[PDB]
Amino acid sequence: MRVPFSWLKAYVPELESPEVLEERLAGLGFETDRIERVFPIPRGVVFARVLEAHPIPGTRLKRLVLDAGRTVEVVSGAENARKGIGVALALPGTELPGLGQKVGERVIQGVRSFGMALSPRELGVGEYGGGLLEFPEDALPPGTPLSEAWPEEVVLDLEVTPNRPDALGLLGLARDLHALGYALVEPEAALKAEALPLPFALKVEDPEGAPHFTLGYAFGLRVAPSPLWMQRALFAAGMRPINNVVDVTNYVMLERAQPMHAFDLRFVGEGIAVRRAREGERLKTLDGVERTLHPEDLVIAGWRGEESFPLGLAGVMGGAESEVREDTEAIALEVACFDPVSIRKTARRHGLRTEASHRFERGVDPLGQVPAQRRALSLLQALAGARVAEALLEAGSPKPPEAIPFRPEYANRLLGTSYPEAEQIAILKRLGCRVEGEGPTYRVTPPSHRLDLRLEEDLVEEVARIQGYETIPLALPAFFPAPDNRGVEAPYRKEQRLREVLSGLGFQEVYTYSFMDPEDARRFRLDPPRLLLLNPLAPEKAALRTHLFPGLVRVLKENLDLDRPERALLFEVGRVFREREETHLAGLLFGEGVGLPWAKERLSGYFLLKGYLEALFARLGLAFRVEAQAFPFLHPGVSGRVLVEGEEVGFLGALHPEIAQELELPPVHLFELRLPLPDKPLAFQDPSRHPAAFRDLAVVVPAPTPYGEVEALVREAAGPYLESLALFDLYQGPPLPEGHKSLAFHLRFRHPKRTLRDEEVEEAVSRVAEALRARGFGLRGLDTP
Amino acid sequence: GYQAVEGPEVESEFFNFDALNIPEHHPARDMWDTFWLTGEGFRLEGPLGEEVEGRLLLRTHTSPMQVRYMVAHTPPFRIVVPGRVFRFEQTDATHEAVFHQLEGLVVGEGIAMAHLKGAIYELAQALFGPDSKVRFQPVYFPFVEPGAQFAVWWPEGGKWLELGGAGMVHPKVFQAVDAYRERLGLPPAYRGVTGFAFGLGVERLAMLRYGIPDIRYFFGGRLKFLEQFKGVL
Amino acid sequence: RVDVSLPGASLFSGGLHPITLMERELVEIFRALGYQAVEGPEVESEFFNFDALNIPEHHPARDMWDTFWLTGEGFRLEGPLGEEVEGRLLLRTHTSPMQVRYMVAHTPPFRIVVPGRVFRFEQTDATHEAVFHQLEGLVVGEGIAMAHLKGAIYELAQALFGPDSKVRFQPVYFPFVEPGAQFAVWWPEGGKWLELGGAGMVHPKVFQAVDAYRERLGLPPAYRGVTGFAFGLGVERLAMLRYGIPDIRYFFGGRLKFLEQFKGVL
Ligand SMILES: [Mg+2]
Numbered sequence A: 001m002r003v004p005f006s007w008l009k010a011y012v013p014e015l016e017s018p019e020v021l022e023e024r025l026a027g028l029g030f031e032t033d034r035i036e037r038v039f040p041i042p043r044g045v046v047f048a049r050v051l052e053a054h055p056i057p058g059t060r061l062k063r064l065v066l067d068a069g070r071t072v073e074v075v076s077g078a079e080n081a082r083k084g085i086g087v088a089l090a091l092p093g094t095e096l097p098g099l100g101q102k103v104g105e106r107v108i109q110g111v112r113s114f115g116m117a118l119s120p121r122e123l124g125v126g127e128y129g130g131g132l133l134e135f136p137e138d139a140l141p142p143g144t145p146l147s148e149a150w151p152e153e154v155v156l157d158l159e160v161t162p163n164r165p166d167a168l169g170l171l172g173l174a175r176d177l178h179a180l181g182y183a184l185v186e187p188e189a190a191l192k193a194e195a196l197p198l199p200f201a202l203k204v205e206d207p208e209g210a211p212h213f214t215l216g217y218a219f220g221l222r223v224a225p226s227p228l229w230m231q232r233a234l235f236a237a238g239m240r241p242i243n244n245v246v247d248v249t250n251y252v253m254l255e256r257a258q259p260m261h262a263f264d265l266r267f268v269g270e271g272i273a274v275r276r277a278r279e280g281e282r283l284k285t286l287d288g289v290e291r292t293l294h295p296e297d298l299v300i301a302g303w304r305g306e307e308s309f310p311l312g313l314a315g316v317m318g319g320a321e322s323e324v325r326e327d328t329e330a331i332a333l334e335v336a337c338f339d340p341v342s343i344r345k346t347a348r349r350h351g352l353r354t355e356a357s358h359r360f361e362r363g364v365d366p367l368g369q370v371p372a373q374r375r376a377l378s379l380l381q382a383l384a385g386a387r388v389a390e391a392l393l394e395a396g397s398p399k400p401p402e403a404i405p406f407r408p409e410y411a412n413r414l415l416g417t418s419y420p421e422a423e424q425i426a427i428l429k430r431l432g433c434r435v436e437g438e439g440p441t442y443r444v445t446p447p448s449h450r451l452d453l454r455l456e457e458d459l460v461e462e463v464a465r466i467q468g469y470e471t472i473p474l475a476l477p478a479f480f481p482a483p484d485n486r487g488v489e490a491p492y493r494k495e496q497r498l499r500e501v502l503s504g505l506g507f508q509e510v511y512t513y514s515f516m517d518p519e520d521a522r523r524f525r526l527d528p529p530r531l532l533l534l535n536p537l538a539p540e541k542a543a544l545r546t547h548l549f550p551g552l553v554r555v556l557k558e559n560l561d562l563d564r565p566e567r568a569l570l571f572e573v574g575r576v577f578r579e580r581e582e583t584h585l586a587g588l589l590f591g592e593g594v595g596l597p598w599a600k601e602r603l604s605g606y607f608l609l610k611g612y613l614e615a616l617f618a619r620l621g622l623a624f625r626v627e628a629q630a631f632p633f634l635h636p637g638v639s640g641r642v643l644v645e646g647e648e649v650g651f652l653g654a655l656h657p658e659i660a661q662e663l664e665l666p667p668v669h670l671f672e673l674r675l676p677l678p679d680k681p682l683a684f685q686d687p688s689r690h691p692a693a694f695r696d697l698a699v700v701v702p703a704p705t706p707y708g709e710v711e712a713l714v715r716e717a718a719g720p721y722l723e724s725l726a727l728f729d730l731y732q733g734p735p736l737p738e739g740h741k742s743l744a745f746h747l748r749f750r751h752p753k754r755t756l757r758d759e760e761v762e763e764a765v766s767r768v769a770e771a772l773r774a775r776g777f778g779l780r781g782l783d784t785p
Numbered sequence B: 001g002y003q004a005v006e007g008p009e010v011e012s013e014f015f016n017f018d019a020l021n022i023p024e025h026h027p028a029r030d031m032w033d034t035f036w037l038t039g040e041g042f043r044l045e046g047p048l049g050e051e052v053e054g055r056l057l058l059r060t061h062t063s064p065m066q067v068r069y070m071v072a073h074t075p076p077f078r079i080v081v082p083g084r085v086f087r088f089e090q091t092d093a094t095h096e097a098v099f100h101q102l103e104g105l106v107v108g109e110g111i112a113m114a115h116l117k118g119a120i121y122e123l124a125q126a127l128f129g130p131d132s133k134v135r136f137q138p139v140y141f142p143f144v145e146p147g148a149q150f151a152v153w154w155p156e157g158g159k160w161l162e163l164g165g166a167g168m169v170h171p172k173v174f175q176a177v178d179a180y181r182e183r184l185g186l187p188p189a190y191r192g193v194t195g196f197a198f199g200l201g202v203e204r205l206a207m208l209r210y211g212i213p214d215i216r217y218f219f220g221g222r223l224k225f226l227e228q229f230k231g232v233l
Numbered sequence C: 001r002v003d004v005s006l007p008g009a010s011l012f013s014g015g016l017h018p019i020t021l022m023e024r025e026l027v028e029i030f031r032a033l034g035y036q037a038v039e040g041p042e043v044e045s046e047f048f049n050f051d052a053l054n055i056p057e058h059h060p061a062r063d064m065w066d067t068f069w070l071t072g073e074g075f076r077l078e079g080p081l082g083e084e085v086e087g088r089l090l091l092r093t094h095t096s097p098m099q100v101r102y103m104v105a106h107t108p109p110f111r112i113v114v115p116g117r118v119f120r121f122e123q124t125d126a127t128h129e130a131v132f133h134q135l136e137g138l139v140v141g142e143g144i145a146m147a148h149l150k151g152a153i154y155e156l157a158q159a160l161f162g163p164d165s166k167v168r169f170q171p172v173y174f175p176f177v178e179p180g181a182q183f184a185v186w187w188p189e190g191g192k193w194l195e196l197g198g199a200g201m202v203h204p205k206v207f208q209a210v211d212a213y214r215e216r217l218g219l220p221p222a223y224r225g226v227t228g229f230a231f232g233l234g235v236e237r238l239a240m241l242r243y244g245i246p247d248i249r250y251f252f253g254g255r256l257k258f259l260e261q262f263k264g265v266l
Helices: A018-028 A170-179 A228-236 A244-256 A340-349 A355-362 A369-384 A408-415 A421-430 A456-467 A490-505 A549-562 A606-619 A657-662 A707-718 A758-774 B013-018 B027-031 B064-072 B113-128 B171-183 B202-210 B223-229 C018-031 C046-051 C060-064 C097-105 C146-161 C204-216 C235-243 C256-262
Strands: A002-004 A031-037 A045-055 A062-067 A071-076 A086-090 A105-108 A111-114 A154-159 A201-204 A212-219 A261-264 A271-276 A282-284 A290-292 A298-304 A307-313 A330-337 A387-389 A393-395 A404-406 A434-436 A442-445 A567-578 A580-591 A624-628 A634-644 A647-655 A669-674 A693-702 A722-731 A740-749 A778-784 B010-012 B035-038 B056-058 B077-086 B098-108 B134-137 B144-154 B159-169 B194-201 C043-045 C089-091 C110-119 C131-141 C167-170 C177-187 C192-202 C227-234
Touching: A002 A228, A018 A031, A018 A154, A018 A170, A018 A456, A062 A086, A170 A244, A170 A421, A201 A212, A201 A393, A212 A369, A228 A244, A244 A261, A244 A355, A244 A369, A261 A298, A261 A307, A271 A307, A271 A330, A282 A307, A298 A340, A330 A369, A340 A355, A369 A387, A404 A456, A408 A421, A408 A456, A408 B113, A421 A434, A421 A456, A456 B144, A490 A567, A490 A580, A490 A606, A549 A567, A549 A580, A549 A669, A580 A606, A606 A624, A606 A634, A606 A647, A606 A669, A624 A707, A634 A669, A647 A657, A693 A707, A693 A758, A707 A722, A707 A740, A707 A758, A740 A758, A740 A778, A758 A778, B010 B013, B013 B056, B013 B064, B064 B077, B064 B098, B064 B171, B098 B113, B098 B202, B113 B134, B113 B144, B113 B159, B113 B194, B144 B194, B159 B171, B159 B202, B194 B202, C018 C110, C018 C131, C018 C146, C018 C235, C018 C256, C043 C046, C046 C089, C046 C097, C097 C110, C097 C131, C097 C204, C131 C146, C131 C235, C146 C167, C146 C177, C146 C192, C146 C227, C177 C227, C192 C204, C192 C235, C227 C235
Parallel strands: A201 A271
Antiparallel strands: A002 A154, A031 A154, A045 A062, A045 A086, A062 A071, A071 A111, A105 A111, A212 A330, A212 A387, A212 A393, A261 A330, A271 A298, A282 A290, A298 A307, A404 A442, A434 A442, A567 A580, A580 A669, A624 A634, A634 A647, A647 A669, A693 A740, A693 A778, A722 A740, B010 B056, B035 B056, B077 B098, B098 B194, B134 B144, B144 B159, B159 B194, C043 C089, C110 C131, C131 C227, C167 C177, C177 C192, C192 C227
């Protein structure tokens, strides 16, 4: 909302300056996006009266003869250059802001043009450039410089929130500043009506979508250009002046956030009918577009006998036919409150957004209609010398706002302030509220234009913004939290340590979008996405990720192309969506690996990633194990399932080569788990102060037998005295019976209370040897010191 | 004294809009550019593990979690809920569709706006020093009244930084909480309490505090960018 | 074929000492109550360790602490404001001295917690050590009262042992507090009251020492109209009964077979 300074100043006469006004408005809750300066009019631009306009033969140009103090002539091809109007003449020599060039006397089709009449755009007072500025013929003495009648203006571009629709009118803003202490000069409706019947009637066919409608009658109209003061005001407001009557309606709308429209009686017929549009009903709206009304569009319609025609789109835009033009002599003034919801839908529907719809969606003073009529009518009388009928046609009866109970004590209790009772009630009163009661609990009834004042809290905010948020003191609360809130953060804390332990080990954190390309479910061989968007940013972002890894893999490629990393070890914790929303942990290792830079021997791939994971798991103090199992996306030969504390939580393996090939990537190893991991408490086990007993043994096993199965066997059989079991050698070849391998194991037996007798170790290593062979395994070695 | 609790990214319109006083066809709804979701066989569960029914969406703010918390816990308490939020927008050097917010909520007998100004004051002091000062101005939010926006005087940048919003929880938010508690068989707990809440953007801080010029780096996943933050604890 | 169950490369995995875990657990509890952790020197001067804290020469109270005295030339002990502090050197018998060092260098209000290693000349047994750790707190400000002390310890109990935990206070004597007290927590799962530590309201003479010394260094006095409370507790005692460590001698015993058991504890 452009709030033109000199205009607002007409209601709040004491405003210090635009800079102060901006500061004032900030504290009231309105922030200005910018402050522009606007009418730098040169002295070379003068006011001239067009005495006669002669067409130049064989051209579309005209030779205007102007009284500009001296009689000069100007050539113009403007569709509206005509005698009997005032124009802004740019005398030769004038440098123009708008056309950026210098105006000069010049020969045009046989006539020497002394300068040029200007369009809103060339003068720089507006964007419109389709015609000459039209001032009343006698606005000023021919020759007197425009600047003198059209001074610069400072315009503030305010942000006006949805809760304050009343601020979409300058008077609305003025009443707020008034509560601060400024003087309010409300304009008076100087009307001289005359009792006579209205020549038309009103029929509201939908009082649900038009709860209050009023029509006024003005006749004997003399449509002409608006006074310079009204032209300047409208231009500053971001609006272009049309003529006498249409301008009054734009001026009063901005003045009070009450859109209104004048209809030429000629097109009304017998009366106005507010009703819904009929199927396929059409309307050529002001914009020139012939639209097709939808059955849910509220419409202002006129009827004649048994015909009802659309005159305009209710509270959005008027028809181009009934628009007030030059020959119009009598009109019907529409001033009403429409249902926000209805106007909203119709506006969206037709892709329209006008100053009218804009204010109707937010809301309008349910009882401001009549006063708006008197204001506009009064001006029409003053500007277009209209004769105005006394009676108005009114439909609807809105109930005034309801009273709200106010406890000054509670106001202070909620803010933590201590503004005195009296001081609070005076604020409420300055704002226009009617306060009833003697206290402690008052009955405060808000003005009809403050749609936002319904609860007591609403009222306490009023005391606060007028007193100033700066006046609210600082303080800290002290209390014991209710029992169920204790320990409430354990989870968040647990996951945050997980990330920390991960970065500690050496993993680099990555953030990836929650969105997934549906096609990827294919590229990676996963079940399709369960949640898809109805309004995606793009097709490749049309689904919610079911897995984490696909994304990591992509950022990996993206990195390789931009920079050529020799290696990477990433990790990500994030939400994943499938059946239920769940948190996952996933990582990926790629590249050369770990080792001496200046040497070739390196640790890498599967067993390196499995290392960082076993390391990770010892720190979390959990039991970790990998059993082989196939996964569509994994590589058959390097694919396994992760078993944390005995349960399957995810996988680990090498990316399937085919997927690798399609995406042009080198091999990559990765894993994905489902958080939160099991929680295992501390069971302190007092270590034995007695010496361990060592023993080495090898097991001959058929090549396909998994190391994990052997390990479990030796372990389960070793007894309660086994302390450590470790694999030190993996061999398979001669003279080992072919198709077999050997697993070397360092074992350690330790008895808690006392030292072990050799017969105990021996007998124990026998239970292993026994069950080892009962499974069909051989003993390449045992009882080695 | 604030505890951190997280909430789901995929929410229901009830918790994200309706309970927080932001209804259908209402100007306020326009403040949030929602990503709506469709999908069969997805279970969204409410505060007490109940199947919550509503039209699904990606949360446009963390606020819903504050209703989920209130229905499942009893006052007094102080919570902070960090989280990823989504908005349908065209991603530019200072705009993202996916970003993070952090919202707080303190509820109890006697909590007043003074206590809200005090918390943000402590936030400013901690982020930017003793010579830091906060500023509050009126603004509108459907779920708080009074409502406000706060800015911190960043002394080294010599300028006021607009950090976020805050206000006193709206009467209608507490009614929604209890009414829903009653629906699940829980006795009401928010009858005689007051409370304040604030919410702020993380990226905004992170950028001006670590000097990151483009908000698009955050989700860009470039190792050459991320590695620079290895030294930051 | 690649055997996925084969052990991967053997990278090392660390762990933290039981005492660091426990100390960390207590500091975060108090951080949530607005307390900041500051540390102090292990080698102290008799002034800060005894004299300023109202524990004078040849006085029964001095017998409560079995001091290790120190001798050594060319050692610089520096006071709160980097000044050379003169006194007879010793290994601190408690962390309390740091509370005087803090007060002389800072102005109220504030809340602090100072964890630290302390020494006492004693014969080390299954429940006695000569070197162990304490954690002391101090809150000073206008209007701080004993009710606030009972509240803090209450919050400590709730955090360590649950909502069904309750604290108990009884009178006891300390030269540096009046009133003075000892506190115990109802450990519901152990079904018994645990004596945790001491506490009380800072003694008038401790504030006088602080200001008098501030004045000596050119600082204006700051503890004239304030009150304050302080408490102090043993870490090993908690650590043992919370992690189930039977012998206090394990802590400094350095046995990897003992320490490794606490790898999983965060
Ligand atoms: Mg309000």
